[PDB]
Design a protein around this ligand. Structure first.
Ligand SMILES: CCCCC/C=C/C/C=C/C/C=C\C/C=C\CCCC(=O)O[C@H](COC(=O)CCCCCCCCCCCCCCCCC)COP(=O)(O)O[C@@H]1[C@H](O)[C@H](O)[C@@H](OP(=O)(O)O)[C@H](OP(=O)(O)O)[C@H]1O
Ligand SMILES: [Ca+2]
Ligand SMILES: [Ca+2]
Lengths: 229, 599, 173, 38, 51
């Protein structure tokens, strides 16, 4: 509502079927009319919905097996600029540890919110008494299994970052650069465009323009025009 | 206990303010005011006229036009409580957490400046003035950002009525608060210029406007840029603009003064009035009708409220004085045996009417603030008159006692004690009437001693020669004390007053410009005495969910820009040298901890 | 260009029969135009140079001061002329007593004998009812009214404070 | 012009604000070294 | 001479930092600075917004 130009941000919702309240109207093999004021109802601020049917009516958590693969496929997709994909973890129960492990084995950067407790704080405090910590954030958790899971996660710290309230764009840039690896200068164009849009001069000058990465004119022409405009 | 940081911290960690605030705790907050504080006295007075009765205090302070109908939205109530108790940091926090930010900042400035004149302790008033300046600056910065984002939405935000502040617009709140920095903002001035030029382009040159005014056919050329019925549309577009109405009224008022002077100096005979005097009467009648129309429009509201708003304006007071004196003079003139009294009353009335021309000067940036300077120099003169009167009494009575004029009566004594020494300040020094060395010596008295005859008509027929050297010495001392010392004391006061206004001349002129544009935005398009047509038309005219959606969208836009403004301020604060040094000290502490743990 | 054009106009008028005096006056003003051109020479000197700019801006200050001066002169002069009611009234005399005479009071030329009836002789020099006095000034009007002359004196007192001090020192500031 | 610009840049580098900024960055590097050493 | 065109564009649009950069990258520096001052002072009298 506060924007003065065209629409640029789209909210996409992935939800499990059977949990959607008043879903009876949606069955019409067309503009449907949805009485959301009557399980949980769909949020009207979103522009598109994916309702993953687990088969088990009313079951929760069956949409992860599609959501993670969709995120990975978008991460591997090209426009011809690569599309960066990032995961933000506000908090979580023991299942969010499994979610983070699955999103780390199939490389996807993750952000952990500090001070919000749960799995986010559990993973943040070990990054920057281990059984005591696991019990502190998971009083009912299985200490041995949780410890094994936390060690498996911490094997690959390159895909984890901690976001502290004490900004967002800088942390996003650091996380995106940390997991790139290659050096053909085609994998860093997306980060360069993000840095141009967010005015991250130091991040670009430090990470993106190093002697390892062999840039040349046609790589930088579009970014130069973006910075000029 | 006034801990703003803990108030910020506890709310940010999930304390639902909507459920927290209750009338009991809201009343308990006002119980925390000091017993000797101004707000405590105001609450006690309101209760003497148990609920807190804060709304009554707001009505007494801000008036019906701008006072919130408290309780109001917990943020508004908390902001009002913090403003009443002069809690600067908590008021700032409550402002930055709530909505309607521009109007709330203007209203906060108004309230703080109102309460600053009501406090006996000087430094408390200084604190309130400082907080009012801070809130005004915040409002100015936020409106600047909003205007740079979108001119149309900013203009809509500027002219909307805010329910939280008595349905007053931002411009009315700024006018009441005397927030001259808000009027000087570029967006406000651009909007005011667009209102001033009406349907003409604001880039039209002044010479083109004058030439088209004195040559109406030039309107339809390309001389004037506008932003069969087509001809009438352009005619009404040119003549309906506030600037064109202002020019027409300037011409009309100059012609009215010329007619007044002509009648006074030539046509005002004891015989019954002629044609030109009747025309002057009708012109003054139309001026009175225009003043009545302005009063009935407040310059829905009750009639007394509109009349008080009209009377609050000093130019309307000058108009009322002029019209009342004109009516008194005409009434005396039409009465047998009161012709001379009517003449003198109308002579003074012409002076009252002519000084009204100074309001026209406010259209010009150079001439505008000089009116304020002159108005304050008048107070300087008023204060100088005490010293002048004391010195005049001393010197005049001493000189009159030494000279002993034989032609002594109360008017002559007053003339020689006050009037004659006063003219010496301006170079009128009658040596031949005070120095007996310049007079002839004659036996023009019966008393013992030597006497001399002054040649002046009002100098007294015979004065004493005894100790005339002392009269001359008193004159010498007078020329030094009055002509130089007291006059230059007044001049130094004048210079100080001039410098104070010359420091902020643009702010004064832009506030004056707002007042002028608002005045002529609603005036009828016909100038007097032809304004009778418009008044007659008005008299005949009288005698014979989506909105809230747009409001919510506009407020969301404003709150988003307020958030950007606050984020920019926080980011600027984080990168200051003091904060860098503090963080460096903390990280050195962390390094020391690491070194201690490593051994 | 102004100086040379005025010189040419004055010489042309002078060489024409019946325009000798007009040429004289045009050349008299032209001499003033030529003489103020000497100020350009001052710019060779560091002390005299910037004073020319200062004078040029003070001229704009005077231009803006003239609005206040004109308003106050109109008010005071018309009030005084209406109170005194001089019998010798015609447009040039009225203009002289409304604008010129109050203006010279700013510079210490105060003709008390032409405004104060206590300093005049009282004579029946009018046909209208009331009391009249004769001012001695040539351009002061032959006969003035005595009614409310204290108000004329009070207006003079107020004028000497408003104009000689307040407005002049506004211009000086 | 290049000499003038180099002199300006060298004067900017030695200001107290830039010294404090570089000190903060080097303290960050020292903290990184201490974290890696444990 | 692209630097002159870029400097003119930055001066017309009141882009202070980019104008400074384009000046420091180009040649004819003294005359370019004087011309930039002239252009900016000319356009400063033509703007309705005071700031
Ligand atoms: C006259 C002086 C110039 C003049 O007109 O000034 C106008 C007054 O408005 C009138 O309507 C003033 C109208 C005065 C009319 C006087 C008529 C005198 C001639 C006839 C009588 C002549 C003498 C006859 C004697 C007869 C005896 C029988 C200016 O009014 P303003 O509202 O534009 O300016 C105000 C005003 O100056 C305030 O006094 C001033 O506040 P303070 O200085 O604190 O009192 C405001 O400043 P702040 O915001 O900083 O507080 C200014 O912003
Ligand atoms: Ca990438
Ligand atoms: Ca009025």
């Amino acid at each position: 509502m506060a924007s003065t130009g065209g629409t640029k941000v789209v909210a996409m919702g992935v939800a499990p079927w059977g949990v959607v309240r008043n879903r009876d109207t949606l069955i019409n093999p067309f503009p449907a009319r949805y009485r959301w004021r009557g399980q949980f109802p769909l949020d009207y601020n979103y522009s598109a919905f994916f309702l993953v049917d687990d088969g088990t009516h009313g079951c929760l958590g069956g949409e992860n097996r599609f959501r993670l693969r969709l995120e990975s496929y978008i991460s591997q997709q090209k426009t011809g600029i690569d599309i960066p994909v990032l995961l933000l973890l506000i908090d979580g129960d023991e299942k969010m540890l499994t979610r983070i492990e699955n999103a780390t084995q199939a490389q996807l950067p993750c952000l952990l919110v500090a001070g919000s407790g749960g799995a986010a704080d559990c993973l943040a405090e070990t990054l920057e008494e281990a059984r005591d910590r696991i019990r502190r954030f998971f009083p009912k958790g299985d200490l041995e299994v949780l410890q094994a899971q936390v060690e498996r996660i911490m094997t690959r710290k390159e895909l984890l970052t901690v976001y502290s309230s004490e900004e967002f764009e800088t942390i996003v840039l650091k996380a995106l650069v940390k997991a790139c690896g290659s050096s053909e200068a085609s994998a860093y164009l997306d980060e360069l465009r993000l840095a141009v849009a967010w005015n991250r001069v130091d991040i670009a000058q430090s990470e993106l323009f190093r002697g390892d990465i062999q840039w040349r004119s046609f790589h930088l022409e579009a970014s130069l025009m973006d910075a000029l405009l | 206990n006034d801990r703003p940081e803990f108030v910020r911290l506890l709310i940010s960690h999930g304390l639902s303010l909507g459920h927290f605030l209750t009338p009991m705790r809201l009343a308990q907050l006002y119980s925390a005011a000091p017993s000797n504080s101004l707000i405590r006295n105001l609450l006690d007075q309101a209760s003497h006229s148990r609920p807190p009765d804060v709304g009554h205090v707001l009505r007494m302070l801000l008036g019906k036009m701008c006072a919130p109908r408290y309780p109001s939205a917990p943020w508004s109530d908390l902001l009002l409580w913090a403003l009443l108790l002069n809690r600067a940091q908590m008021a700032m926090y409550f402002w930055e957490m709530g909505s309607n930010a521009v109007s709330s900042a203007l209203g906060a400035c108004l309230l703080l400046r109102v309460m600053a004149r009501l406090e006996p302790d000087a430094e408390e008033a200084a604190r309130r003035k400082d907080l009012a300046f801070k809130f005004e600056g915040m409002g100015v910065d936020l409106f600047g950002e909003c205007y740079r984002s979108s001119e149309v939405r900013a203009a809509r935000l500027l002219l909307r009525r805010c329910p939280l502040w008595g349905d007053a617009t931002c411009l009315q709140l700024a006018m009441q608060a005397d927030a001259r920095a808000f009027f000087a903002q570029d967006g406000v001035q651009s909007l005011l210029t667009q209102k001033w030029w009406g349907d003409m382009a604001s880039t039209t040159p002044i010479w083109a406007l004058v030439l088209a005014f004195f040559c109406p056919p030039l309107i339809y050329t390309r001389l004037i840029t506008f932003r069969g019925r087509r001809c009438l549309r352009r005619w009404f577009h040119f003549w309906g603009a506030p600037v064109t109405i202002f020019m027409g009224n300037v011409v009309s008022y100059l012609l009215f003064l010329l007619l007044f002077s002509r009648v006074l100096l030539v046509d005002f005979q004891p015989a019954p009035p002629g044609s030109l005097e009747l025309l002057l009467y009708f012109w003054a009648f139309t001026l009175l009708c225009e003043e009545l129309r302005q009063g009935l429009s407040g310059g829905h509201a009750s009639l007394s409220q509109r009349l008080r708003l009209y009377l609050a304006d000093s130019w309307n007071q000058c108009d009322l004085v002029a019209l009342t004196c004109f009516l008194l003079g005409v009434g005396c003139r039409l009465t047998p045996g009161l012709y001379h009294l009517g003449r003198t009353v109308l002579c003074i009335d012409f002076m009252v009417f002519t000084v009204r021309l100074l309001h026209i000067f406010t259209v010009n940036k150079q001439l505008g603030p000089k009116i304020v300077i002159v108005s304050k120099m008048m107070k300087d003169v008023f204060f100088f008159l005490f010293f002048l009167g004391v010195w005049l009494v001393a010197y005049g009575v001493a000189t009159e006692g030494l000279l002993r004029p034989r032609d002594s009566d109360f008017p002559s004594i007053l003339r020689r004690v006050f009037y004659r020494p006063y003219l010496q300040i301006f170079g009128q020094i009658p040596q031949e009437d005070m120095d007996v060395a310049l007079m002839e010596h004659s036996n023009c008295s019966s008393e013992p001693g030597f006497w001399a005859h002054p040649p002046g008509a009002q100098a007294g027929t015979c004065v004493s020669q005894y100790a005339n050297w002392l009269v001359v010495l008193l004159l010498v001392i007078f020329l030094l004390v009055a002509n130089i010392l007291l006059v230059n004391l007044l001049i130094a006061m004048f210079s100080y007053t001039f410098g104070k206004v010359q420091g902020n001349s643009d702010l004064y002129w832009k506030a004056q410009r707002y007042r002028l544009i608002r005045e002529f935005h609603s005036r009828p398009a016909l100038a007097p005495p032809f304004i009778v047509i418009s008044h007659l038309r008005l008299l005949l005219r009288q005698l014979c969910y989506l909105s809230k959606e747009a409001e919510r969208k506009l407020l969301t836009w404003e709150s988003v820009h307020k958030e950007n403004f606050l984020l920019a301020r926080a980011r600027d604060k984080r990168e200051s040298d003091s904060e860098r040094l503090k963080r460096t000290s903390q990280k050195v502490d962390l390094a020391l901890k690491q070194l201690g743990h490593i051994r």
